[PDB]
């Protein structure tokens, strides 16, 4: 080159803009084969030869290797919707990807794109508005009904598919069973509080919830027994080793005569500290730091049961159901140390059992409050896995119903819908504005019609009939009904969704709207690049 | 005092926290200097019109340069001009034209799309950042202009 | 200009100037490379009709004290006390952003920020390191707020 | 200076891939389906240690093979969940899984979405489980010669089928013994506490099953007794060994008398530790850690006898045979951990080395199985053999159910769901019946193995079956000839058959869910 | 990168390899150790004086 | 942000800002003015001056 020497690649105009449509629309294709309850699944193999099979859109995204920055701007937003909310993962990777397609056309004739990116923000702004017209009232509908409904169009187009009646009731039971009551009049679900277990072995439709906890570890030694009838569970956060002279304090000897008692004193420092333990009636105690063989001796002939290596997640949760306290230390508020009988946990049962040649421990009729395990059974590891991440995505629908009271038809009735509004909404603009958000409408219905592809239909009459349908919910006020027409795959047919028990929760829609527009924004923002050669 | 800054990317936030910390700066140099200016690209044709009838008065070969000097300030209104896809030869005529027969306060308007009074629109600017902004200019210029020879060293 | 590496000599000295109009004002860092561009190729046909170069570095100055009081006598006064004009100044300095469509957020809390640092009574000089911004992804731009009192990450 | 977006990974979709993981799924029972009835033979494998594995075992066929493709590793896996959950059935399993899938294929050709075929297989899948519970039959546990008949049905396809009458004795033995319930209501079988043990030499005829343990070990001095009639034993966890602190110690001495004061006093704590094991009158200790060789000198003055460290699995089966308990201390040794259920204790020895035994318990808990014969090779197929068998016992002791062998149960389950298809109308009837039809795999291979004629056979095996109450009719394994299971006595748990029916159709469903691969992405 | 008039502080940056020069560039170094000011000065005038005197070892 | 002391007892050292546009300038506009700082302090020393502008070579 001749002016601007930076060592280094630039590129303007049309190059820069094309280019960084192309990339941010491959992301789409790689995705676009698993939505819908007619998609398929994928493998990642990567080069050490570990197999993962998911159709989870951020999971996928999450494993590829991109170095694009337009496409990395796409696998953040994928990321970003599920720590807010926790689906809808693929959907907001495709609409994203086609707002930028749909726009680049636009520019291309000459528009100048920051009027096209205050058209895109209006139709934003009004399409939330508007969606407070199509709720759906939690209370209205069945309390069980809707939150079973919910849970089952949201594990639809997955490996649990048509088990839904059996998983969400088992999906519903347990979110039910760590409600928690908190200041004023707010309740509180926390999902990921209720421990996910997975071990090969007999079928998925023999998977069972447990009321209580459950626990990968197994009890210390052999000699131990193995089943306690009422237990008196004590939680413990320090080693229960041979105690130890602190680093700062040496050991001089001048007098051989006193070294026997010194020796005994390691070894009986501890001893003490079991003996105020097992004086109260404990019968189980978990530790989070090791026990050293020898203090296993004073379990085993007390006939109590021990475990050490405990997370302290796992803890935590315990003794909050059980009504024990973590202890970091015996001391009181006066010099000794004491353990009183009013700071034990309580539960109706503990048993170690068997699940496919290995141990674990179960936690039964917690009295203190209630919680919830479930235990996954499967052909093998890879399946196994799969279910473990379609339920996480189950727990955290039910769980956005219950605290929002508000759900929105599925199947791209509300896409059906804002396309027509929109159409409809842009004539009284009368200013550049108006095409930008036309282009918006357009974009919108990129959902129903990779719904109806996958399914081997006809992609253009069936969304044409949704069209007219949805125009006479608009006029003619009487036919206000016929809002929630919805799709049917199987039969390729619409019917009314409401009715055939297909739902979402409005904060999937409404987030996934604003956070799509933000992305396309920002990259519509660029009309140049400067790349520098690495050192 | 603190704000709190949300987003949706990394770039994003940077970039909306960039824009913060000159709405700032801007409100700083306004109680440095009491002083407001009409923006637009005014102060810089007003700058050329007056710098043009002052290089008349001159002689000599200081004549020429004032006049380059004064055709320099063009610039900056025909790149507003250009970026909003007007034609910028047709606009800074209408503005050069504007200025030299009363108001001053003309000056590009992209909402309208043509030229109108700028005041109207509520975009003003505080003085130090123009004052400033020639100030540096000519003192680098002049040190340009001493330099003589580049050689390489260790 | 920072974060791209150029390598002439003569363009090293452009990215200092514009740090400098960065330290003093905090707006028009763009600008002030512009008429400093301008000025330099306007030298090149001077040079070719003759002049010496120390009468151009001469001339120069000259009509940089002209445009000086130009300005000047176009600027208008503000009093601190007037809030309007305090914000018309702030967005306008704000809608050349990507955060043009949240200046009807912004632009109220920006000039509260440097309300509640400074004394409009005896104000000569503002500090901006009693005013923190924090960074937090998630949300959108349309979730900023201001914090009167202190936030801790930790 | 190129412009990339994957750098650097491979993509492949379309039919092609559907038709790719089936085409290797078929692979790998073609493989093993060599190895299946009472005529099948037997391969060797070669390991990177340069080992030899002659072997008949399904799972153990595969587990050395190494192979790249995703679809393969799916078939791999299932092989060896099938083991670790009902021991036996690894390898009609893979026909079956093999079979079902290739069936399939044949429905995508006709432009069929596989969400179509999957919600018919696992409909179909509910009434195979309710027919094979319907044909169950009830056994009784407390009829010896009719456990021997369950295990013997299960190892007269194995090596062993020679030996068989021995085998069954040695497994239900075992079984029989470590059976423990404890604590509350929990019953268990556990079998890290049946333990293997392989000589070689003898004769296969010289297996036998003791009331106790072995250990390969010797006593420690030889002035100590090796032939004990009732030995009192006690079990220790520590060393009986002056061992130093951990408190940062040092020791700083400043007089003539002080530095043999020292050294005298490491021997009077061994002399304080010697003489409280002595207090409780034991004739044999067994600790897991070093003995100094005073205490060696105290031990023999009291005429007990002590062995070195002995493996911490060793010491809990010895703790459940004689009764003891293991102690860390000896200050808290007391009558209630001192084991008296031995009957003898005898030190012998076997081709140039010393084993230990205990053995005549009063009521062990525990059980060494030893085992006698050519070579390393054919006693390592013997183990694997009686592994099987002694998981085939315990199943039968968990649910006592039984459903015919020899193929009779897939064909009653074949006529059941054929004509309950007819009462379906829909697409789904299609893949409803050849998931049916795929059963007829198992009987197939068996004659094929014996050296008869599949088409007349099985023809005639299906029209017999229409009958009304001829559903335990099956196929003879060794001559060819269509027999009833009542008479030729062939049974098998009902547990091994519900899973390999659960775990054939769910790989089948996972494997019809794929439609692209991505590789080499490098984590 | 430096902009400078100074005539010692550009002799001190340049790397010369000729013996002859570096007995300039030390001159220069001291002088401005020493008063401060004519650096550029001394080293025209002594090199100048070599000038002629190249001429009249010709002669 | 600095300390400033005035109106101070002695006053026998100073401090002296500079400014200017680049990094090029501060440091042209210090190192120019230690010339004149130091030939000033070698007259004060010695205070005796001869004339310049070539005055002084063509009178040797
Ligand atoms: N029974 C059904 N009929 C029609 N559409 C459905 C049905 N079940 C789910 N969907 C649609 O599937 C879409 C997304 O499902 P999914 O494949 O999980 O993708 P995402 O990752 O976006 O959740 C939703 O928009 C919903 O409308
Ligand atoms: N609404 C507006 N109409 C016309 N000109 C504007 C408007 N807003 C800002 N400008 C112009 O933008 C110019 C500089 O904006 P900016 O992009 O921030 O560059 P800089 O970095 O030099 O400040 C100013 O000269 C100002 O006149
Ligand atoms: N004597 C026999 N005659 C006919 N079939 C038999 C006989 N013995 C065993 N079988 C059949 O062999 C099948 C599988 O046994 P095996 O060869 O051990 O393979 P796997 O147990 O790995 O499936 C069983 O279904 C059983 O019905
Ligand atoms: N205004 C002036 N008129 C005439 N001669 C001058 C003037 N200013 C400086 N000089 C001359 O310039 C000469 C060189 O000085 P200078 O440029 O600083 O280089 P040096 O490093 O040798 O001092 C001096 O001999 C001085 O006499
Ligand atoms: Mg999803
Ligand atoms: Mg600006
Ligand atoms: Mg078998």
């Known amino acids: 080159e001749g002016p601007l020497s930076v060592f280094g690649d630039r590129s303007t105009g049309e190059t820069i803009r094309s280019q960084n449509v192309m990339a941010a629309a491959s992301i789409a294709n790689i995705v676009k084969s698993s939505l819908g309850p007619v998609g398929l699944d994928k493998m990642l193999v990567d080069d050490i030869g570990d197999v993962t099979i998911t159709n989870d859109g951020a999971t996928i995204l999450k494993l590829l290797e991109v170095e694009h920055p337009a496409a990395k701007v796409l696998c953040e937003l994928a990321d970003l919707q599920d720590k807010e909310v926790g689906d809808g993962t693929t959907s907001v990777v495709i609409i994203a990807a086609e707002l930028l397609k749909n726009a680049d056309e636009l520019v291309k004739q000459k528009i100048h794109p920051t009027s096209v990116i205050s058209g895109y923000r209006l139709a934003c702004k009004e399409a939330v508005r508007y969606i407070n017209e199509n709720l759906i009232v939690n209370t209205d509908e069945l309390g069980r009904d809707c939150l079973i409904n919910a849970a089952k169009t949201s594990m639809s187009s997955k490996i649990i598919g048509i088990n839904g009646d059996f998983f969400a009731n088992m999906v519903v039971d347990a979110v039910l069973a760590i409600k928690y009551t908190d200041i004023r009049g707010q309740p509180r679900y926390p999902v990921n509080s209720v421990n996910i277990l997975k071990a090969h072995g007999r079928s998925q439709m023999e998977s069972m919830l447990i009321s209580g906890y459950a626990l990968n570890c197994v009890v210390g030694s052999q000699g131990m027994p193995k089943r306690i009838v009422n237990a008196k569970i004590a939680c413990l956060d320090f080693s229960l080793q041979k105690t130890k002279m602190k680093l700062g304090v040496q050991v001089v000897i001048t007098d051989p005569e006193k070294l026997d008692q010194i020796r005994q004193r390691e070894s009986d420092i501890t001893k003490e500290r079991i003996q105020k333990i097992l004086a109260t009636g404990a019968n189980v105690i978990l530790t989070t730091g090791g026990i050293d063989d020898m203090c296993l001796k004073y379990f085993v002939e007390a006939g109590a049961m021990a475990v050490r290596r405990v997370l302290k997640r796992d803890l935590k949760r315990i003794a909050k159901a059980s009504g024990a306290t973590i202890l970091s230390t015996l001391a009181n508020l006066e010099g000794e140390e004491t353990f009183e009988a009013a700071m034990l946990g309580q539960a109706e049962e503990v048993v170690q059992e068997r699940i496919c040649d290995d141990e674990l421990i179960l936690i039964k009729n917690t009295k203190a409050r209630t919680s919830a395990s479930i235990i996954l059974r499967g052909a093998n590891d890879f399946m196994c896995d799969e279910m473990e991440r379609s339920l996480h995505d189950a727990l955290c629908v039910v769980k956005r119903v219950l605290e929002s009271k508000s759900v929105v038809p599925g199947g791209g ?80 047919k619409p019917r009314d969704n409401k009715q055939a028990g297909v739902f979402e929760p409005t904060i999937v829609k409404v987030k996934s709207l604003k956070f799509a527009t933000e992305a396309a924004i920002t990259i519509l923002r660029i009309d140049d690049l400067i790349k520098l050669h690495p050192e | 005092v603190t704000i709190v800054v949300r987003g949706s990317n990394k770039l994003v936030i940077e970039e909306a926290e960039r824009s913060i910390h000159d709405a700032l700066c801007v409100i700083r140099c306004l109680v440095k200097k009491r002083a407001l200016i009409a923006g637009g690209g005014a102060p810089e044709i007003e700058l050329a019109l007056r710098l043009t009838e002052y290089s008349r008065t001159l002689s000599g070969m200081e004549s020429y340069c004032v006049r380059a000097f004064a055709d320099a300030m063009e610039v900056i209104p025909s790149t507003l001009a250009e970026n909003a896809g007007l034609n910028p030869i047709s606009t800074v005529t209408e503005l050069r034209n504007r200025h030299a027969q009363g108001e001053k306060t003309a000056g590009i308007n992209v909402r309208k799309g043509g030229i109108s009074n700028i005041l109207e629109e509520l975009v003003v600017q505080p003085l130090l950042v123009s004052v400033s902004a020639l100030t540096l200019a000519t003192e680098t210029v002049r040190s340009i202009l001493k330099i003589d020879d580049v050689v390489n060293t260790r | 200009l920072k974060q791209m590496q150029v390598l002439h000599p003569a363009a090293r000295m452009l990215v200092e100037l514009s740090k400098a109009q960065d330290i003093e004002a905090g707006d028009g860092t763009t600008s002030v490379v512009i008429i400093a561009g301008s000025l330099l190729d306007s030298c090149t046909k001077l040079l070719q009709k003759g002049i010496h170069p120390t009468i151009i570095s001469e001339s120069f100055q000259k009509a940089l004290e002209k445009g000086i009081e130009i300005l000047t006598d176009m600027s208008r006064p503000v009093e601190l006390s007037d809030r309007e004009t305090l914000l018309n100044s702030a967005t306008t300095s704000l809608n050349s952003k990507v955060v043009s469509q949240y200046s009807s957020l912004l632009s109220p809390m920006s000039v509260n920020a440097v309300m509640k640092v400074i004394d409009p009574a005896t104000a000569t000089s503002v500090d901006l390191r009693d005013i923190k911004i924090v960074k937090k992804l998630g949300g959108t731009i349309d979730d900023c707020e201001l914090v009167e009192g202190l936030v801790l990450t930790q | 200076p190129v412009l990339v977006l994957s750098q650097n990974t491979k993509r492949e979709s379309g039919r092609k891939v559907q038709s790719g993981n089936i085409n290797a799924a078929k692979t790998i029972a073609d493989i093993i389906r060599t190895c299946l009835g009472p005529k099948s033979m037997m391969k060797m494998l ?181 032939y004990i009639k009732n030995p009192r034993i006690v079990l220790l966890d520590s060393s009986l060994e002056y061992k130093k602190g951990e408190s940062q110690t040092d020791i700083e001495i400043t007089r003539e008398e002080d530095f043999t004061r020292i050294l005298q006093m490491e021997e009077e704590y061994i002399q304080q530790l010697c003489e409280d094991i002595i207090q409780l009158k034991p004739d044999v200790v067994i600790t897991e850690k070093g003995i100094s060789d005073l205490a060696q000198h105290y031990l023999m003055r009291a005429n007990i006898t002590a062995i070195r460290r002995v493996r911490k699995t060793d010491n809990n089966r010895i703790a459940r045979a004689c009764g003891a308990r293991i102690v860390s201390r000896p200050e808290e040794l007391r009558e209630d951990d001192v084991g008296t259920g031995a009957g003898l204790l005898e030190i012998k020895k076997i081709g140039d080395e010393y084993f230990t035994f205990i053995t005549d318990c009063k009521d062990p808990k525990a059980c060494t199985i030893l085992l006698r014969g050519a070579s390393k090779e054919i006693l390592s197929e013997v183990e694997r053999n009686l592994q099987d068998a002694m998981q085939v016992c315990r199943n039968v002791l968990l649910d006592p159910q039984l459903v015919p062998g020899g193929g009779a149960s897939e064909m009653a389950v074949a006529h059941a769901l054929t004509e309950k298809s007819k009462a379906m109308t829909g697409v789904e009837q299609w893949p409803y019946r050849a998931v049916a039809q795929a059963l007829e795999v198992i009987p197939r291979t068996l004659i094929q193995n014996c050296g008869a004629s599949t088409i007349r056979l099985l023809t005639s095996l299906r029209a017999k079956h229409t009958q009304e109450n001829c559903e335990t009719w099956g196929v003879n394994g060794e001559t060819g000839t269509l027999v009833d299971m009542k008479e030729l006595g062939i049974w098998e748990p009902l547990a091994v058959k519900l899973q390999t029916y659960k775990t054939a159709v769910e790989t089948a469903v996972l494997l019809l869910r794929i439609d692209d691969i991505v590789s080499g992405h490098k984590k | 990168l430096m902009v400078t008039n100074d005539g010692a502080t550009i002799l001190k940056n340049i790397g010369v390899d000729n013996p002859a020069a570096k007995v300039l560039v030390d001159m220069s170094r001291v002088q401005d150790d020493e008063v401060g000011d004519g650096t550029t000065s001394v080293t025209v005038l002594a090199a100048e004086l070599l000038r002629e005197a190249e001429s009249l070892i010709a002669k | 942000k600095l300390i400033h002391f005035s109106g101070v007892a002695l006053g026998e050292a100073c401090t002296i800002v500079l400014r200017g546009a680049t990094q090029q300038i501060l440091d042209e506009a210090e190192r120019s003015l230690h010339d004149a700082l130091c030939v000033l302090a070698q007259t004060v020393k010695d205070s005796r001056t001869v004339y310049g502008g070539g005055c002084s070579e063509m009178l040797m």
């Open chain 1, 413 to 492: 009735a509300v896409e059906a819908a804002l396309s027509i509004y929109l159409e409809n909404y842009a004539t009284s603009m009368g200013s550049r504005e108006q095409l930008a958000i036309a282009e918006f409408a357009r974009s919108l219905l990129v959902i129903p019609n990779t719904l109806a592809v996958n399914a081997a239909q006809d992609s253009t009459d069936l969304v044409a009939k949704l069209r007219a349908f949805h125009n006479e919910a608009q006029v003619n006020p009487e036919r206000k009904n016929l809002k929630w027409i919805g799709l049917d795959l199987s039969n390729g």
């Open chain 4, 46 to 226: 070669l390991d990177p240690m340069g080992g030899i594995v002659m072997t008949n075992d399904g799972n153990a066929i595969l587990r050395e093979i190494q192979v790249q493709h995703p679809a393969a590793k799916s078939m791999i896996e299932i092989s060896r969940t099938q083991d670790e959950e009902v021991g036996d059935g690894t390898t009609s399993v893979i026909i079956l899984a093999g079979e079902m899938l290739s069936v399939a294929e044949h429905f995508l050709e006709q432009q069929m979405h596989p969400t179509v075929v999957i919600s018919a297989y696992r409909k179909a899948l509910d009434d195979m489980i309710s027919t094979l519970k319907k044909i169950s039959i009830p056994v009784d546990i407390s009829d010896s010669d009719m456990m021997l008949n369950i295990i013997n049905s299960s190892i007269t396809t194995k090596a062993i089928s020679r030996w068989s009458s021995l085998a069954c004795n040695i497994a239900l033995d075992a079984v029989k013994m470590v059976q423990f319930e404890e604590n509350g209501r929990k019953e268990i079988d556990i079998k890290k506490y049946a333990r293997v043990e392989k000589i070689p030499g003898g004769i296969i005829e010289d297996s036998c099953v003791l009331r106790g343990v072995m250990i390969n070990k010797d006593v420690t001095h030889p002035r100590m007794r090796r």
